[PDB]
Amino acid sequence: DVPENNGILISIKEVINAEFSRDGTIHSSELKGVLELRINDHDLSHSNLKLADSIDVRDKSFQFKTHPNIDKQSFLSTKLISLRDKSKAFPANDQSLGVLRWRKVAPAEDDSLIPLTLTTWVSPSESQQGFDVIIEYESVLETELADVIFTIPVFPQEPVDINTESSTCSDAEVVNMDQEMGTSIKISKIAANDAGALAFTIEAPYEDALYPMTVSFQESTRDKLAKSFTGMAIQSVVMANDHDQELPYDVITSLKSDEYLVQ
Ligand SMILES: [Ca+2]
Numbered sequence: 001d002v003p004e005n006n007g008i009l010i011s012i013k014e015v016i017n018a019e020f021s022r023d024g025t026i027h028s029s030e031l032k033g034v035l036e037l038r039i040n041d042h043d044l045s046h047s048n049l050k051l052a053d054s055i056d057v058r059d060k061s062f063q064f065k066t067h068p069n070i071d072k073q074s075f076l077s078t079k080l081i082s083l084r085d086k087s088k089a090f091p092a093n094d095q096s097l098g099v100l101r102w103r104k105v106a107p108a109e110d111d112s113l114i115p116l117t118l119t120t121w122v123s124p125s126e127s128q129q130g131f132d133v134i135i136e137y138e139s140v141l142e143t144e145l146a147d148v149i150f151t152i153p154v155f156p157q158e159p160v161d162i163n164t165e166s167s168t169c170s171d172a173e174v175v176n177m178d179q180e181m182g183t184s185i186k187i188s189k190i191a192a193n194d195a196g197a198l199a200f201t202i203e204a205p206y207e208d209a210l211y212p213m214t215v216s217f218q219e220s221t222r223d224k225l226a227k228s229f230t231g232m233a234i235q236s237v238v239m240a241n242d243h244d245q246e247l248p249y250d251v252i253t254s255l256k257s258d259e260y261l262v263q
Pocket of ligand 1: 235
């Protein structure tokens with residue numbers, strides 16, 4: 001599952017946690033991120049990274065931390081990732097080096113770190129001993145999400161009946177009823193910037209038994225002009241001596257969910 005490197009590969013990896021109320025209010029969110037650098041050719045070992053000048057490297061809310069061998073100074077003044085010791089070069093063993101980390105915490109009702117909103121509507125059902133559930137979602141991502149997995153923490157006896165007419169992605173399917181994990185429903189696609197819903201009926205003792213519901217999703221692009229969800233990105237890669245001398249590179253921009261849930 002490790003992506004292919006043609007010389008310099010820069011991975012920008014962000015992970016998002018979030019907690020919503022049943023009615024859709026954001027209680028909290030926390031985003032962690034890291035910039036990893038992989039190089040496999042000694043010709044390119046002796047290089048520097050220029051972050052997009054779109055980025056405020058002094059924003060206190062991002063809590064930016066640089067690897068202890070990176071030059072804090074050049075980073076802070078020039079948005080430049082380079083080694084303190086200008087005589088040394090980066091490892092050329094194709095191994096991931098984390099050169100920069102960041103973390104952002106948003107308080108209740110701040111929706112700036114939320115790629116996917118969530119709300120639930122829940123009534124007792126006719127057809128089963130339990131509940132009719134609708135989960136409304138809305139993406140604000142510019143790419144589309146694939147194989148999104150909603151998990152309810154119950155193990156019912158009768159199987160789940162997905163209301164395919166009242167849902168948006170009609171071919172949603174259950175993919176797991178364990179006892180340990182509970183019941184997990186998968187969705188093919190969530191379209192960029194589009195709202196949707198997932199509707200179904202499920203067996204359960206009482207309403208609180210359905211929560212917390214967890215969502216799980218993931219997204220990746222290899223585009224060289226890619227921005228992260230928080231606007232993180234590379235301007236250029238550049239010779240450690242001749243700063244006008246550009247070098248070639250690829251960049252992967254990921255965003256995975258971790259503890260993303262409705263409670
Ligand atoms: Ca450029």
